[PDB]
Amino acid sequence: MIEKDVVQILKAVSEFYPGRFQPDDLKGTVKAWHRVLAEYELEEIMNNLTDYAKVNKFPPTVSDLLK
Incomplete structure (x- = not known):
């Protein structure tokens, strides 16, 4: 996926985890x-992000979304 598509993945993680996922340097992440x-x-x-949020209290790392 191109970069703009990565920007969406990160916006979704943030929608799922209000106030618990706030990268100090979004552009860098x-x-x-x-x-x-x-x-x-x-x-x-x-x-994969959807299946992960159904059972986890803490936000995912990039490795948690590859399977």
Whole structure:
């Protein structure tokens, strides 16, 4: 996925976890998660975020969304 698609993944994590996920440097987090996320598709990862939020009190790391 391109960068703008990474910006959406991060906006969703933030919607799921109000007041518990606030990166001090959003632009920087987008750039770093993209090094991992360029090999994946937007639709698959969004589906994985949904399954993760159904059972976790704490926000995910990028590794938690690849499967």
